[PDB]
Each structure stands twice: as structure tokens, then as C-alpha cells.
Write a protein that binds this ligand. Structure first.
Ligand SMILES: O=C(O)c1c(N2CCCCC2)nc2ccc(Cl)cc2c1-c1ccccc1
Length: 133
């Protein structure tokens, strides 16, 4: 599959504006401070139509498994109970989370040897760059 580009184990190497993104999402002070320190690994695997994305860190471990285009329940690292849908749009994994009348969009894409994750809440964008572990 094309989703091959994404499979593997990735380590966070840089972050920009994540604190600001988390504020916009509504994450509280203490969670933001601890989550912001974390250097998670992101583990992406595919088994048939099922994609699994795991985040492993000192703060929280999370795991989502899904089929493209099929809405699912997700409890996020900051304990939001959200409705998520993930699609593959021109090679970019696009993940939309809906909760309490709010929405955020997280895009995962390959750029050179990096996996670039861009998170947007209203106007506030954060960029998280990962390299292969
Ligand atoms: O890395 C994450 O999976 C990730 C995340 N994802 C990934 C990119 C940011 C937006 C969606 N969104 C978050 C939203 C709010 C909070 Cl408190 C944490 C996260 C974390 C996260 C950060 C550090 C350790 C563990 C999990």
C-alpha cells in the first residue's frame, strides 16, 4: 500500500507551538506542562484495512486503530472524548476530531526522511517533526 510511507517507529525530534495549540484545544495548565515535555514515539502499522497509530511516552501511552473513512471513538491523551475520522487525501493522513461542538484537524505526511504532523485548532497551528527511530 501507499500507507507503507508511514509504517514504522518514529521519534519526535522537534516541536513548534504545541503549547499554544494545546491551549486552544482547552488543555489545562498541568497537563500542558507535562505533555509538552514529552518526547513521544509514534508507531504506525497496517494490517489489512486496519491502521494502528500508537503514541508512547513518559506522559501517556495512547493507541488508535481505525479503517479509513469510518468514524470511531477516541479518548485523547488530555482525556477529551472525541469522534474521530481519518482519511487519506493525496498521500496525507487527515484526522478530524469532533467534541463539544469543537473540531481540530491533524495531518500526518512524509517529507524527505521525516514524518511531519501538523495540528490546527481555529487559527493555531503546531508542527511536530519525527524521524525514524
Ligand atoms: O503525540 C501525540 O500523540 C499527542 C497528540 N497528537 C499527536 C500530535 C499532536 C496532536 C495529536 N495530541 C495531543 C493533545 C493533547 C495532549 Cl495533552 C497530548 C497530545 C499528544 C501527546 C503528547 C505527548 C505525549 C503523549 C501524547
Amino acid at each position: 500500500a501507499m500507507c507503507d510511507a508511514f509504517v514504522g517507529t518514529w521519534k519526535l525530534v522537534s516541536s513548534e507551538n504545541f503549547d499554544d495549540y494545546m491551549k486552544e484545544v482547552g488543555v489545562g495548565f498541568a497537563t500542558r506542562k507535562v505533555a509538552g515535555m514529552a518526547k513521544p514515539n509514534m508507531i504506525i502499522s497496517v494490517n489489512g484495512d486496519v491502521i494502528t497509530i500508537k503514541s508512547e511516552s513518559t506522559f501517556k501511552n495512547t493507541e488508535i486503530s481505525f479503517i479509513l473513512g469510518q468514524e470511531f471513538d477516541e479518548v485523547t491523551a488530555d482525556d477529551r472524548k472525541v469522534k474521530s475520522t481519518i482519511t487519506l487525501d493525496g498521500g496525507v493522513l487527515v484526522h478530524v476530531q469532533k467534541w463539544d461542538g469543537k473540531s481540530t484537524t491533524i495531518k500526518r505526511k512524509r517529507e524527505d526522511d521525516k514524518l511531519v504532523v501538523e495540528c490546527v485548532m481555529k487559527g493555531v497551528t503546531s508542527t511536530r517533526v519525527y524521524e525514524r527511530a
